[PDB]
Amino acid sequence: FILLKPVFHCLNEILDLCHSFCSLVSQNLGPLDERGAAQLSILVKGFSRQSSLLFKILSHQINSDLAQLLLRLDYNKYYTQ
């Protein structure tokens, strides 16, 4: 799906924001509310908005692209929300 810009210019961000979260947790084993919480919760909400947006886009009708949805639709976790 590298060819189509929207799926590519949104999934890349799903990974880049995750790198930043992975860095915040990487910073300390001691609990961190030093502005981490402010962005960590912005992040939980931010990742749900984009993660559901591409769930909606996912749902040539390639068997691979459509069938992939059902691993997530086993719980219908994003759609149910």
Partner: protein
Amino acid sequence: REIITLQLGQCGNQIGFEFWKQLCAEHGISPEGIVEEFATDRKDVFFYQADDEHYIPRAVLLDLEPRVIHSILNSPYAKLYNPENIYLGNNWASGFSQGEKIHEDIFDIIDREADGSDSLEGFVLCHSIAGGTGSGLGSYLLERLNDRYPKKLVQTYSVFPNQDEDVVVQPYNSLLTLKRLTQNADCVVVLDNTALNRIATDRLHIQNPSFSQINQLVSTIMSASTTTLRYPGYMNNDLIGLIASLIPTPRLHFLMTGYTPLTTDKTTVLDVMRRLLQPKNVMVSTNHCYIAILNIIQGEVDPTQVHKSLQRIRERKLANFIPWGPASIQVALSRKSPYLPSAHRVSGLMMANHTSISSLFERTCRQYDKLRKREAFLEQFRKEDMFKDNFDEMDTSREIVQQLIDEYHAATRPDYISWG
């Protein structure tokens, strides 16, 4: 990093002896550890590399009151396993005390291998629960390893013992082992003597020599559980990467087993999956539900159908689960090896987190609770009383395992988001 297997106790030493032998023939290794002339696999993790192609596995063999450790030595494969690291009661307390005096020399044998390897990722124990010497010594060694290697992780191929219920203290010994296993083991893979004995009665007429034949059954599962690591692939190219999906909450780290061609001695992926979810293929004996499921297939498997197989298995819904965990089943593939027979060209295994295994834990807790009231077998052996005058570790174990029994059923409930 290379995996070091701490096989201990007569029963545990029997299934490590066979598991290494199973990977001897499966891999390109002879009984003297020499590269086979007849011979594409990642042998680095399981087999240490000697210069003249002596593929000696990193096995740590611990013997206590030895009998079957002497028979292991008089074998054609004695040369194959030569890290030259073997060091000299039926009570859990009797095993724990014996381990404590020899802890430093057995622990130096652990160090030697850790220093020798480029790296060490996990300690895989061929543990025997209520194993007489095997339990107690195994619980103690389980406690020392985590403290020394806080970053490292420990797995347990626990052969949980169910023989229709001889050991009169069997429930007491098992009760103590789990308490250590629940707080001091990163992962555990559960097996059952009765479940396999029932399979042995099913596939074969073998009944009286249940232990010798069932060894092969435990082995096929053991070799198979690691084949994705022992042979290279797209995903699960390291133990830890695979472990995460199977255990979603730390307390619930017990894993159920199954094998599609129990009689492995063409088949489409759609078929080998459905067969596995059926309960005859399972080897373990209020709503109940799986937490996550995983499957690995090694054979002539078409690729275009494997995703269609996951979809087809989704329509059948042969596997019922509505747990707190969001983990859905995934279709994994591993490389069937050449040289050895290719019978059942397609053949599979499944490792799953299931709340049914809670019932097996409660049955030994039931035998123990009944036994505790009677105090019929307190042993009161001076070792048992002097080691445990209060007898309160058994009660500490009883609350910890009851928390586990409770946590499991909490998993079944809709709110494991709240504390379990």
